[PDB]
RNA sequence: GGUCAAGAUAGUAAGGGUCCACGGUGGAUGCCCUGGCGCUGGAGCCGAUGAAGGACGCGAUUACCUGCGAAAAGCCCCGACGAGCUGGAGAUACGCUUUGACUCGGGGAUGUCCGAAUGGGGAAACCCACCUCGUAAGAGGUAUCCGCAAGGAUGGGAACUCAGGGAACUGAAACAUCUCAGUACCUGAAGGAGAAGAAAGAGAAUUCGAUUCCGUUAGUAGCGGCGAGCGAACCCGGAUCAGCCCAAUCAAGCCGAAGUGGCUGGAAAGCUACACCUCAGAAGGUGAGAGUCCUGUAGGCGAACGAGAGGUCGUUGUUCGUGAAACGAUGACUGAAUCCGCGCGGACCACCGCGCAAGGCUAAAUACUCCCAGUGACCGAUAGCGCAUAGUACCGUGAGGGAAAGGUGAAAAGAACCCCGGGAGGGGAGUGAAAGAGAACCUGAAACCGUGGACUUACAAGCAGUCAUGGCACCUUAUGCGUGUUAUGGCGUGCCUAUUGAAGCAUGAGCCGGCGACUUAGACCUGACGUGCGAGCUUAAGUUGAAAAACGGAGGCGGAGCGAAAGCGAGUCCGAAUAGGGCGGCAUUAGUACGUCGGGCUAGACUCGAAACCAGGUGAGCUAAGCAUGACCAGGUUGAAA
RNA sequence: GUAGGGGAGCGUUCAGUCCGCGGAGAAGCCAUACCGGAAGGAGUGGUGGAGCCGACUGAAGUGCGGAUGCCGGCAUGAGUAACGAUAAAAGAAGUGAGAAUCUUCUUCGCCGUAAGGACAAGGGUUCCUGGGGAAGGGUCGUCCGCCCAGGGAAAGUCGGGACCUAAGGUGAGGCCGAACGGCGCAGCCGAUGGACAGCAGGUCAAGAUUCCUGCACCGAUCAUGUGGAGUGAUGGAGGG
RNA sequence: UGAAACAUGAUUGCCCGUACCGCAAACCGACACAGGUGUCCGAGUGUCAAUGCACUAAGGCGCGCGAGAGAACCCUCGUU
RNA sequence: GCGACUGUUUACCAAAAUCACAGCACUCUGCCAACACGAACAGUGGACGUAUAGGGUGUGACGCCUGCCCGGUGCCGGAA
């Protein structure tokens, strides 16, 4: 008995083309370029998952550095005197405190400096 | 310039025809081996 | 592929005979046999009805016009009748005379 | 609040982008069959009484097909059928037929011209005749060979068979013996089959007993640049049987049981409540799925006609390649005995066995499959034959090559009629269940072209993505982990193949569809899983039955090794024994048949791709020339011999 | 994690079997934010019009982006290049639904040992009449060598055969040869040649040494005559 | 004793080919294609003559895309 | 410079110094001639020609000419 593709291929293909939208030109419309575009897209997804884990960390950091400096502290010195008084805060939170909660950041500062000297 | 095919009725027939094709063995053979392929075009006699 | 093909090009009935429509819209109606086409297995009963338009055709008749006449049918919604009952009425074949062959029901004949 | 000043940001889209809606293009997919394909079985020749195959004709209108033959879609006779018929073809008018048509079976008659063509010629289907009879119109005859005559032969046939002739590529990783392989092809003859056949045989048992066929022996004996590779037979089981003579019943057809009511529906066959048939539940048609409508099936009948010698030299055949070369087989030379004789037993000799050369026929089993029928873990429109039909269209001077082609509906009820236009096309209407079927008429994918809408886009640098956030939009697996779109950021070297290394300026590719490549066979090899019997395991060919399978011990595998072999044997071999290799015990252990699979070998062996090689044929209407025959060169200048 | 070996599975068809759906609608197709570890598979909505899902088991033509792969369709290049000789066109008039292009008219331009005329070979209805306008026409077309229908072609003297032979092709007997076959005298086929009786005019929309008018020629068979004894081949010579 | 030859009258007259294109849009070149195709006839004026050249007659056409522009550049040609 | 000359040649990148030629030269060949096509004692060309003919080979009008080497190869002849 013979068994044409009949259906399967159109199936596979559409799957890709439905992943494949928003894509500029041919990419969103022809299979090969679509599936392809998606190979690379794969690479970018994986890496950029861990990557965003980096990037956010960076962001939090610069916000804290700011905070410290807003009084007279370095990031490194603030964070270090916040290791010294053992104030074991996540730094994401520290950003949050720093930019949305003023006088709190103030206190955490005075603390870090105290524990530093 | 001038071409391969310059028709000649007497040539055509005295060359490819039926008295001609039957005059030789391999032309009998051409004949029936054509017939088998269901030629309407048996031979240039049949033009 | 012919219609009488699978019906041994066989007309179980005849030109003249009364008929009753088994299955269809015309469920049960009476009709003399006006036209019985065996090969195509098609046939005309005075029932059916139809409105046909016979197009421009200037001769005869300049304008078109229409026509109430009737569409033929398939000898498989055609049914022979039983004089008594008059309905869904099979047929047996018997012999009256004298090498004349005939046709009964479960109570002959027709 | 007006003026001026500094600073910030908005909107427009020529066009484009993403998404969305809506068509177009195209004809994938699903469904379907009106066409295939294979296997089993049946059937199997035609023709001088004109074959296959054609040409031209026959029609009220006739281009193609079909049927036919100037008696021309037909004619006579018989038989079945009994109401319709007037070919596909779907068109009018003409008609025919219950005194029996049409269709079917069975014979007959008529059958132009070409074609073995056959009165002679010819470029097939055309030209010109002579003879006999006729009043003419017509009819017959006029080939050649075997024959006294009567009579037979000629040509065609897909394969199947026999014969004369007989390749190469290939493999041996080169080639030449060799292998391909007596294969491809050519030719001759012949049949429904053919061939072969009634022993100077196999042979080793003082056994069998014509042949052909299958199983098996058996990849054993052997062949071989002993390399590649090549490879029997006797016996044993089956199929089917035969041995004779001469020279001193199917083919046309008929007949066949048993349901209705309501319900949905455009439509009942489906749902349902109660029914009956069955030797009949195989199938197909009917508005959607019918045991009980129809045609049928199980069954029963069934026709006038109808069918049932030796030797020598060069060589070769079998497993037979000069090898110890037997034997047959023939080309050339030689050409013995006929019974107290002849031929063979693989050189050769005796012995001892099997055999009757020089004369013929022979059914049966076997091979094939143009054709007919039945079936199918065969195809359904890129499949399947090349063809849903066509060897046609088209290409080719020729031989030869050679396509894509499918679908309105249940039924034509095929759209009278009004509207814009010459039309084409469309918008109504009307039919239908549906015109979301309208004749470019089933679904209608994708590339591809457009209209509209959302959000965006004119200081911007880009493998076109990702990931984060803001904007805007939307709310039928959907108000949150949202969806569409977007701005800004970070980040980021298409895919494949080929490689030391690919974004590569290295290969491939316009895009999307659909077709596209690791298989099959053998009762071979060897393994893994599994199973059934288990010191035991197992059939093959066949036979019978066959909506199933059973029978079939003939042979196969295990049983014991060792040597070169004879042979010996839990031993054996080398040798004179020793000392050892192989082996048995062992300190112990299982086989075999099936099946699924991982590998192997032989054959195309994963698919595609050569340049080349060989056979048979087709081409000198092109070009190179030959031959026979015709044709052709305004006008002018120069001024040889004699 | 590359070549590679191993493990478990996803989907496609055909098949056996069961669960079972379907005109209150099957498959196929279309949309989507659901589910599964993945091959994948469900829900609902729109399409469609008559068939099909699921489980288990069996057998495969069983999963494509590539092969400068094959078939087909549609894109790019692009509204680009080109419209096929630089012999050249104007105005009026007409027709038509529509005209630079078709039909009249009046001019202009080109060929004129041709770009005129008559034949042959080849082609095959392309000729003439009336009509048509899808496509063929390199634009347009009302037009055409395209489409439809109907008509048209006439021979004793032209040309070929009923006569001849060349090259060549044949060819009973004949000479050869594994077969098919290869030769081959006479005879026969074979025009490109030999032979041979008619010229002048007229006319259909379309024929012309054919038909028609006028006046000829050649062979053949019969008859009345001049008859009044020779006719003259399958061989001879001349001639051609 | 009807042999030829002849005159005249009668009478007879087979078979195919004849359209049209045929130096081309109708044949061979895939095409309504600047090619190829064999023989005949092919007027006049001027010119030593002529089938030569210019221009003409009879006849046949203006070759089946048009219109405008008046740059680069390209082709064929004039003058320098 | 090359060829003497008229001629010929690579259809579709080479027309010449190519090739042919008249001329000369070596040999071969006595007729069923050599030589050539050939299933082949066929038949055919050679040729219905006959050594002033026919084949093969080379040079290449014409003019003055064409030397030296016979060991190897070929060829002709010889014979113990
Ligand atoms: Mg980290
Ligand atoms: Mg716009
Ligand atoms: Mg016919
Ligand atoms: Mg009768
Ligand atoms: Mg009947
Ligand atoms: Mg008759
Ligand atoms: Mg004849
Ligand atoms: Mg070889
Ligand atoms: Mg080899
Ligand atoms: Mg035969
Ligand atoms: Mg011997
Ligand atoms: Mg041998
Ligand atoms: Mg012997
Ligand atoms: Mg399809
Ligand atoms: Mg096909
Ligand atoms: Mg209309
Ligand atoms: Mg838009
Ligand atoms: Mg800037
Ligand atoms: Mg901007
Ligand atoms: Mg790949
Ligand atoms: Mg490299
Ligand atoms: Mg690049
Ligand atoms: Mg590249
Ligand atoms: Mg490379
Ligand atoms: Mg096992
Ligand atoms: Mg096994
Ligand atoms: Mg393999
Ligand atoms: Mg199933
Ligand atoms: Mg299905
Ligand atoms: Mg592809
Ligand atoms: Mg490329
Ligand atoms: Mg433009
Ligand atoms: Mg451009
Ligand atoms: Mg431009
Ligand atoms: Mg242009
Ligand atoms: Mg033009
Ligand atoms: Mg012009
Ligand atoms: Mg006027
Ligand atoms: Mg008008
Ligand atoms: Mg014009
Ligand atoms: Mg002319
Ligand atoms: Mg005309
Ligand atoms: Mg046009
Ligand atoms: Mg008009
Ligand atoms: Mg001959
Ligand atoms: Mg002539
Ligand atoms: Mg004459
Ligand atoms: Mg004549
Ligand atoms: Mg006359
Ligand atoms: Mg004609
Ligand atoms: Mg033109
Ligand atoms: Mg031309
Ligand atoms: Mg003249
Ligand atoms: Mg003149
Ligand atoms: Mg001139
Ligand atoms: Mg003209
Ligand atoms: Mg301007
Ligand atoms: Mg100057
Ligand atoms: Mg020269
Ligand atoms: Mg050249
Ligand atoms: Mg040249």
PDB file of N, CA and C (backbone and C1' of nucleotides) in Angstrom, chain E residues 79-105:
ATOM      1  P     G E  79       8.105  49.426 -12.864  1.00  0.00           P
ATOM      2  O5'   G E  79       6.607  49.802 -13.270  1.00  0.00           O
ATOM      3  C5'   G E  79       6.319  50.650 -14.391  1.00  0.00           C
ATOM      4  C4'   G E  79       6.681  49.991 -15.700  1.00  0.00           C
ATOM      5  C3'   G E  79       6.291  50.760 -16.969  1.00  0.00           C
ATOM      6  O3'   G E  79       7.162  50.332 -18.039  1.00  0.00           O
ATOM      7  C1'   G E  79       5.227  48.720 -16.988  1.00  0.00           C
ATOM      8  P     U E  80       7.845  51.373 -19.073  1.00  0.00           P
ATOM      9  O5'   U E  80       9.355  51.390 -18.592  1.00  0.00           O
ATOM     10  C5'   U E  80      10.422  51.263 -19.526  1.00  0.00           C
ATOM     11  C4'   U E  80      11.530  50.375 -18.993  1.00  0.00           C
ATOM     12  C3'   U E  80      12.398  49.675 -20.045  1.00  0.00           C
ATOM     13  O3'   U E  80      13.460  50.501 -20.533  1.00  0.00           O
ATOM     14  C1'   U E  80      11.713  48.118 -18.354  1.00  0.00           C
ATOM     15  P     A E  81      13.404  51.198 -22.000  1.00  0.00           P
ATOM     16  O5'   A E  81      13.941  50.046 -22.939  1.00  0.00           O
ATOM     17  C5'   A E  81      14.673  48.975 -22.396  1.00  0.00           C
ATOM     18  C4'   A E  81      14.901  47.911 -23.411  1.00  0.00           C
ATOM     19  C3'   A E  81      14.209  48.112 -24.753  1.00  0.00           C
ATOM     20  O3'   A E  81      14.977  48.906 -25.630  1.00  0.00           O
ATOM     21  C1'   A E  81      13.813  45.922 -23.954  1.00  0.00           C
ATOM     22  P     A E  82      14.365  49.546 -26.978  1.00  0.00           P
ATOM     23  O5'   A E  82      13.650  48.319 -27.707  1.00  0.00           O
ATOM     24  C5'   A E  82      14.324  47.521 -28.673  1.00  0.00           C
ATOM     25  C4'   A E  82      13.497  46.304 -29.059  1.00  0.00           C
ATOM     26  C3'   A E  82      12.259  46.566 -29.918  1.00  0.00           C
ATOM     27  O3'   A E  82      12.547  46.603 -31.294  1.00  0.00           O
ATOM     28  C1'   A E  82      11.615  45.321 -28.062  1.00  0.00           C
ATOM     29  P     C E  83      11.817  47.661 -32.229  1.00  0.00           P
ATOM     30  O5'   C E  83      10.365  47.038 -32.426  1.00  0.00           O
ATOM     31  C5'   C E  83      10.104  46.110 -33.474  1.00  0.00           C
ATOM     32  C4'   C E  83       8.647  45.716 -33.519  1.00  0.00           C
ATOM     33  C3'   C E  83       7.679  46.802 -33.972  1.00  0.00           C
ATOM     34  O3'   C E  83       7.505  46.867 -35.392  1.00  0.00           O
ATOM     35  C1'   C E  83       6.921  45.847 -31.925  1.00  0.00           C
ATOM     36  P     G E  84       8.673  47.389 -36.360  1.00  0.00           P
ATOM     37  O5'   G E  84       9.587  46.086 -36.483  1.00  0.00           O
ATOM     38  C5'   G E  84      10.990  46.164 -36.694  1.00  0.00           C
ATOM     39  C4'   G E  84      11.502  44.915 -37.365  1.00  0.00           C
ATOM     40  C3'   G E  84      10.695  44.439 -38.554  1.00  0.00           C
ATOM     41  O3'   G E  84      10.951  45.179 -39.726  1.00  0.00           O
ATOM     42  C1'   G E  84      11.258  42.587 -37.188  1.00  0.00           C
ATOM     43  P     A E  85       9.731  45.801 -40.555  1.00  0.00           P
ATOM     44  O5'   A E  85      10.368  47.108 -41.180  1.00  0.00           O
ATOM     45  C5'   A E  85      11.439  47.010 -42.125  1.00  0.00           C
ATOM     46  C4'   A E  85      12.747  47.439 -41.512  1.00  0.00           C
ATOM     47  C3'   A E  85      13.245  48.794 -41.942  1.00  0.00           C
ATOM     48  O3'   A E  85      13.973  49.356 -40.867  1.00  0.00           O
ATOM     49  C1'   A E  85      14.849  47.184 -42.463  1.00  0.00           C
ATOM     50  P     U E  86      13.347  50.552 -40.007  1.00  0.00           P
ATOM     51  O5'   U E  86      13.674  51.844 -40.896  1.00  0.00           O
ATOM     52  C5'   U E  86      12.876  52.206 -42.027  1.00  0.00           C
ATOM     53  C4'   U E  86      13.362  53.494 -42.694  1.00  0.00           C
ATOM     54  C3'   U E  86      14.414  53.328 -43.783  1.00  0.00           C
ATOM     55  O3'   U E  86      13.806  53.112 -45.040  1.00  0.00           O
ATOM     56  C1'   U E  86      14.983  55.130 -42.301  1.00  0.00           C
ATOM     57  P     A E  87      14.331  51.983 -46.059  1.00  0.00           P
ATOM     58  O5'   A E  87      13.405  52.260 -47.322  1.00  0.00           O
ATOM     59  C5'   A E  87      13.483  53.514 -47.975  1.00  0.00           C
ATOM     60  C4'   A E  87      12.163  53.977 -48.530  1.00  0.00           C
ATOM     61  C3'   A E  87      10.994  54.022 -47.565  1.00  0.00           C
ATOM     62  O3'   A E  87      10.980  55.213 -46.802  1.00  0.00           O
ATOM     63  C1'   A E  87      10.352  52.979 -49.571  1.00  0.00           C
ATOM     64  P     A E  88      10.796  55.153 -45.209  1.00  0.00           P
ATOM     65  O5'   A E  88       9.243  55.521 -45.018  1.00  0.00           O
ATOM     66  C5'   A E  88       8.812  56.581 -44.130  1.00  0.00           C
ATOM     67  C4'   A E  88       7.379  57.026 -44.411  1.00  0.00           C
ATOM     68  C3'   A E  88       6.663  56.230 -45.502  1.00  0.00           C
ATOM     69  O3'   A E  88       5.239  56.353 -45.330  1.00  0.00           O
ATOM     70  C1'   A E  88       6.846  58.440 -46.211  1.00  0.00           C
ATOM     71  P     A E  89       4.442  55.713 -44.068  1.00  0.00           P
ATOM     72  O5'   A E  89       4.349  56.941 -43.022  1.00  0.00           O
ATOM     73  C5'   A E  89       3.150  57.729 -42.885  1.00  0.00           C
ATOM     74  C4'   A E  89       3.243  59.076 -43.590  1.00  0.00           C
ATOM     75  C3'   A E  89       1.963  59.920 -43.634  1.00  0.00           C
ATOM     76  O3'   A E  89       1.715  60.682 -42.469  1.00  0.00           O
ATOM     77  C1'   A E  89       2.965  59.859 -45.765  1.00  0.00           C
ATOM     78  P     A E  90       0.204  60.795 -41.914  1.00  0.00           P
ATOM     79  O5'   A E  90      -0.495  61.848 -42.886  1.00  0.00           O
ATOM     80  C5'   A E  90      -0.657  63.190 -42.458  1.00  0.00           C
ATOM     81  C4'   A E  90      -1.019  64.111 -43.588  1.00  0.00           C
ATOM     82  C3'   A E  90      -2.475  64.323 -43.778  1.00  0.00           C
ATOM     83  O3'   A E  90      -3.044  65.141 -42.778  1.00  0.00           O
ATOM     84  C1'   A E  90      -1.494  63.973 -45.867  1.00  0.00           C
ATOM     85  P     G E  91      -4.197  64.521 -41.838  1.00  0.00           P
ATOM     86  O5'   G E  91      -5.450  65.434 -42.235  1.00  0.00           O
ATOM     87  C5'   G E  91      -5.260  66.750 -42.764  1.00  0.00           C
ATOM     88  C4'   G E  91      -6.054  66.991 -44.031  1.00  0.00           C
ATOM     89  C3'   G E  91      -7.433  66.420 -44.063  1.00  0.00           C
ATOM     90  O3'   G E  91      -8.358  67.104 -43.258  1.00  0.00           O
ATOM     91  C1'   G E  91      -6.419  65.887 -46.061  1.00  0.00           C
ATOM     92  P     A E  92      -9.592  66.288 -42.634  1.00  0.00           P
ATOM     93  O5'   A E  92     -10.492  66.038 -43.916  1.00  0.00           O
ATOM     94  C5'   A E  92     -11.261  67.088 -44.450  1.00  0.00           C
ATOM     95  C4'   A E  92     -11.796  66.718 -45.793  1.00  0.00           C
ATOM     96  C3'   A E  92     -12.947  65.738 -45.805  1.00  0.00           C
ATOM     97  O3'   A E  92     -14.201  66.295 -45.458  1.00  0.00           O
ATOM     98  C1'   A E  92     -11.367  64.978 -47.280  1.00  0.00           C
ATOM     99  P     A E  93     -15.143  65.485 -44.455  1.00  0.00           P
ATOM    100  O5'   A E  93     -15.628  64.289 -45.370  1.00  0.00           O
ATOM    101  C5'   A E  93     -16.211  64.565 -46.623  1.00  0.00           C
ATOM    102  C4'   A E  93     -16.562  63.304 -47.332  1.00  0.00           C
ATOM    103  C3'   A E  93     -17.245  62.223 -46.490  1.00  0.00           C
ATOM    104  O3'   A E  93     -18.638  62.455 -46.247  1.00  0.00           O
ATOM    105  C1'   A E  93     -15.496  61.257 -47.678  1.00  0.00           C
ATOM    106  P     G E  94     -19.349  61.928 -44.888  1.00  0.00           P
ATOM    107  O5'   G E  94     -19.298  60.340 -45.048  1.00  0.00           O
ATOM    108  C5'   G E  94     -19.884  59.715 -46.181  1.00  0.00           C
ATOM    109  C4'   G E  94     -19.546  58.249 -46.258  1.00  0.00           C
ATOM    110  C3'   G E  94     -20.012  57.370 -45.098  1.00  0.00           C
ATOM    111  O3'   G E  94     -21.406  57.045 -45.179  1.00  0.00           O
ATOM    112  C1'   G E  94     -17.784  56.833 -45.680  1.00  0.00           C
ATOM    113  P     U E  95     -22.345  56.845 -43.861  1.00  0.00           P
ATOM    114  O5'   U E  95     -21.815  55.478 -43.231  1.00  0.00           O
ATOM    115  C5'   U E  95     -21.898  54.265 -43.960  1.00  0.00           C
ATOM    116  C4'   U E  95     -21.050  53.188 -43.341  1.00  0.00           C
ATOM    117  C3'   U E  95     -21.325  52.869 -41.889  1.00  0.00           C
ATOM    118  O3'   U E  95     -22.451  52.026 -41.736  1.00  0.00           O
ATOM    119  C1'   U E  95     -18.982  52.973 -42.274  1.00  0.00           C
ATOM    120  P     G E  96     -23.540  52.283 -40.574  1.00  0.00           P
ATOM    121  O5'   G E  96     -22.837  51.672 -39.270  1.00  0.00           O
ATOM    122  C5'   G E  96     -22.156  50.418 -39.317  1.00  0.00           C
ATOM    123  C4'   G E  96     -21.244  50.207 -38.117  1.00  0.00           C
ATOM    124  C3'   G E  96     -21.732  50.771 -36.792  1.00  0.00           C
ATOM    125  O3'   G E  96     -22.698  49.937 -36.170  1.00  0.00           O
ATOM    126  C1'   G E  96     -19.456  51.352 -37.098  1.00  0.00           C
ATOM    127  P     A E  97     -23.677  50.512 -35.027  1.00  0.00           P
ATOM    128  O5'   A E  97     -22.731  51.511 -34.210  1.00  0.00           O
ATOM    129  C5'   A E  97     -23.243  52.274 -33.127  1.00  0.00           C
ATOM    130  C4'   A E  97     -22.475  52.031 -31.843  1.00  0.00           C
ATOM    131  C3'   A E  97     -20.994  52.331 -31.872  1.00  0.00           C
ATOM    132  O3'   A E  97     -20.718  53.713 -31.811  1.00  0.00           O
ATOM    133  C1'   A E  97     -21.382  50.310 -30.703  1.00  0.00           C
ATOM    134  P     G E  98     -20.134  54.450 -33.107  1.00  0.00           P
ATOM    135  O5'   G E  98     -18.595  54.663 -32.700  1.00  0.00           O
ATOM    136  C5'   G E  98     -18.222  54.999 -31.361  1.00  0.00           C
ATOM    137  C4'   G E  98     -17.025  54.194 -30.883  1.00  0.00           C
ATOM    138  C3'   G E  98     -15.755  54.264 -31.737  1.00  0.00           C
ATOM    139  O3'   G E  98     -14.947  55.404 -31.417  1.00  0.00           O
ATOM    140  C1'   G E  98     -16.220  52.004 -31.124  1.00  0.00           C
ATOM    141  P     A E  99     -14.201  56.291 -32.557  1.00  0.00           P
ATOM    142  O5'   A E  99     -12.801  55.550 -32.719  1.00  0.00           O
ATOM    143  C5'   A E  99     -12.733  54.283 -33.359  1.00  0.00           C
ATOM    144  C4'   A E  99     -11.518  54.147 -34.220  1.00  0.00           C
ATOM    145  C3'   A E  99     -11.028  55.437 -34.873  1.00  0.00           C
ATOM    146  O3'   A E  99      -9.602  55.391 -34.991  1.00  0.00           O
ATOM    147  C1'   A E  99     -11.494  53.862 -36.519  1.00  0.00           C
ATOM    148  P     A E 100      -8.688  56.571 -34.387  1.00  0.00           P
ATOM    149  O5'   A E 100      -7.514  56.665 -35.462  1.00  0.00           O
ATOM    150  C5'   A E 100      -7.360  57.783 -36.320  1.00  0.00           C
ATOM    151  C4'   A E 100      -6.186  57.572 -37.250  1.00  0.00           C
ATOM    152  C3'   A E 100      -6.108  56.181 -37.854  1.00  0.00           C
ATOM    153  O3'   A E 100      -6.801  56.111 -39.059  1.00  0.00           O
ATOM    154  C1'   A E 100      -3.998  56.793 -36.959  1.00  0.00           C
ATOM    155  P     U E 101      -8.080  55.195 -39.177  1.00  0.00           P
ATOM    156  O5'   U E 101      -7.461  53.795 -39.612  1.00  0.00           O
ATOM    157  C5'   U E 101      -6.739  53.668 -40.828  1.00  0.00           C
ATOM    158  C4'   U E 101      -5.716  52.576 -40.743  1.00  0.00           C
ATOM    159  C3'   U E 101      -6.277  51.158 -40.758  1.00  0.00           C
ATOM    160  O3'   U E 101      -5.444  50.325 -41.547  1.00  0.00           O
ATOM    161  C1'   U E 101      -4.914  51.461 -38.858  1.00  0.00           C
ATOM    162  P     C E 102      -6.027  49.643 -42.869  1.00  0.00           P
ATOM    163  O5'   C E 102      -7.445  49.100 -42.373  1.00  0.00           O
ATOM    164  C5'   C E 102      -7.844  47.742 -42.597  1.00  0.00           C
ATOM    165  C4'   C E 102      -9.269  47.641 -43.130  1.00  0.00           C
ATOM    166  C3'   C E 102      -9.554  48.404 -44.415  1.00  0.00           C
ATOM    167  O3'   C E 102      -9.328  47.600 -45.559  1.00  0.00           O
ATOM    168  C1'   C E 102     -11.181  48.946 -42.765  1.00  0.00           C
ATOM    169  P     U E 103      -9.126  48.265 -47.009  1.00  0.00           P
ATOM    170  O5'   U E 103     -10.542  48.952 -47.297  1.00  0.00           O
ATOM    171  C5'   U E 103     -11.690  48.187 -47.669  1.00  0.00           C
ATOM    172  C4'   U E 103     -12.776  49.073 -48.235  1.00  0.00           C
ATOM    173  C3'   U E 103     -12.308  50.106 -49.238  1.00  0.00           C
ATOM    174  O3'   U E 103     -12.166  49.580 -50.534  1.00  0.00           O
ATOM    175  C1'   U E 103     -13.752  51.122 -47.672  1.00  0.00           C
ATOM    176  P     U E 104     -11.484  50.467 -51.670  1.00  0.00           P
ATOM    177  O5'   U E 104     -12.674  51.378 -52.159  1.00  0.00           O
ATOM    178  C5'   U E 104     -12.427  52.410 -53.079  1.00  0.00           C
ATOM    179  C4'   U E 104     -13.428  53.519 -52.963  1.00  0.00           C
ATOM    180  C3'   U E 104     -12.981  54.836 -53.527  1.00  0.00           C
ATOM    181  O3'   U E 104     -13.005  54.855 -54.925  1.00  0.00           O
ATOM    182  C1'   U E 104     -14.003  55.206 -51.458  1.00  0.00           C
ATOM    183  P     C E 105     -11.644  55.101 -55.710  1.00  0.00           P
ATOM    184  O5'   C E 105     -11.452  56.660 -55.519  1.00  0.00           O
ATOM    185  C5'   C E 105     -12.497  57.542 -55.887  1.00  0.00           C
ATOM    186  C4'   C E 105     -12.295  58.914 -55.314  1.00  0.00           C
ATOM    187  C3'   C E 105     -11.008  59.603 -55.681  1.00  0.00           C
ATOM    188  O3'   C E 105     -11.002  60.104 -57.007  1.00  0.00           O
ATOM    189  C1'   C E 105     -11.491  59.938 -53.395  1.00  0.00           C
TER     190        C E 105
END
